[model samples]
Target: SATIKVTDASFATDVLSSNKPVLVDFWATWCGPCKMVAPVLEEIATERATDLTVAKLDVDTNPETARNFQVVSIPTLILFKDGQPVKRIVGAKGKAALLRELSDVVPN
Candidate 1:
């Protein structure tokens, strides 16, 4: 329904075990692209409130989860369905593009 803060400690339960589709944003504070995507994600989080769960994992603080997912770049968005990653989108993109990209996974 809303954005959920995720961490190495809560990732498994917050995202991997969630009943709804989970969109996870792997980000770092110093990454410019991550900053650019933050508001876009927040907008999507609110607009798509009932369709999916939006979550963020700070790469700087959650290295283990990032490494496990092989997230070498900042602003890596991973969509998880049924506890498994179904899609991965990297880099910064505009809100419209991001919405188009996630159209299939995020129900209208």
Candidate 2:
């Protein structure tokens, strides 16, 4: 499945209460790093579709969700399981590095 567009309004239903593990990309349009990370995240979303749910929240449009998660930087990636955040990656990374970083939590 394609990455779902998440908003502050849908965060609870989409990420917090999801049945599958949720990978949330907190980003903004003007962030160069965020742009770089977007396609990598899309690749992951396709590869891990059965085991993960990928969502993007635009920080500029969804301030409350970003603030709630304590996301101080753009391109922050948070992995949530069982309704709680379990891992956080704070910058743009290649697909291999990102997969390795999430290897333990994301099922193959």
Candidate 3:
């Protein structure tokens, strides 16, 4: 299945209300760090397809969502479980690092 594209309009309904744990990547096209993290997130989305709900919200396109989340940085990764944010990581995190951060949500 395709990864969902989250926007300011759909964020609450999609991420907050999701039954499964959600990995929301807040990013922008012009951000170098966001670019670096994009592929790693894609790989994670593919590998953890059944266990996680991974999606991207473009800051440039959805500034409202970014403002609502107080996301001052691009490439910020937030893990939402039970309709609330549980973990937040800023900057680019490698695969092993990201998995470690999300172990509580999708333990191996």
Candidate 4:
């Protein structure tokens, strides 16, 4: 499976209408926390490649999406179902913590 890239132009299509639940990561190039969280998310994407859709939206490159989502901080992960946000994590997180968050929306 492939990880989608959520951008200002594609957020609606890539995340909102996704058949599977989406994990949309809000990040910025200059944010250290975002860098720290990237690998964790990538690992999730790789492991759960079929069951989920993982995406990263660069806040600096796609400010419109960030503003629309009310993303006030870097490394914010928004969980979406049917084009609507259902859960969110607001900081750099360990793999266990991030997986816990994902469990809320992903089917058991």
The superposed Cα distance between candidate 1 and the true structure at residue 68, in angstroms, equals 0.7
Better of 2 and 3 by lDDT: 2
Candidate 2 error regions (>4 Å): 104-108
lDDT of 2 at 19: 98
Report the lDDT tens digits of candidate 1 across residue range 1-100.
3689999999999999999899899999899889999998898889988888899999899999999999998889999999999889989989899867
lDDT tens readout by residue for model 4, 1-108: 355677888888889879998999998889999989888888888898888788989989899999998988888999899989988899999888888866655556
Q: Model 2: clashing residue pairs? A: none
In order, candidate lDDTs are: 0.90, 0.92, 0.88, 0.86
Model 1 lDDT at residue 90: 89
**Candidate 4, lDDT over the whole model:** 0.86
* Model 3 lDDT tens row, 43-96: 888998898999899989999988888999778999999899998898898999
Off by over 4 Å in 1: 103-108
Global CA lDDT computed for model 2: 0.92
TM-score against native, each model? 0.91, 0.92, 0.90, 0.90
> Candidate 4 regions off by >4 Å?
105-108
Root-mean-square deviation of each candidate, in angstroms? Answer: 2.9, 2.8, 2.6, 2.8
Task: Looking at model 1, report the run of 10 residues with the lowest lDDT sum.
Answer: 99-108
Q: Measured by C-alpha RMSD in angstroms, how accurate is candidate 4?
A: 2.8
TM-score of 4: 0.90
Rank list by lDDT: 2, 1, 3, 4
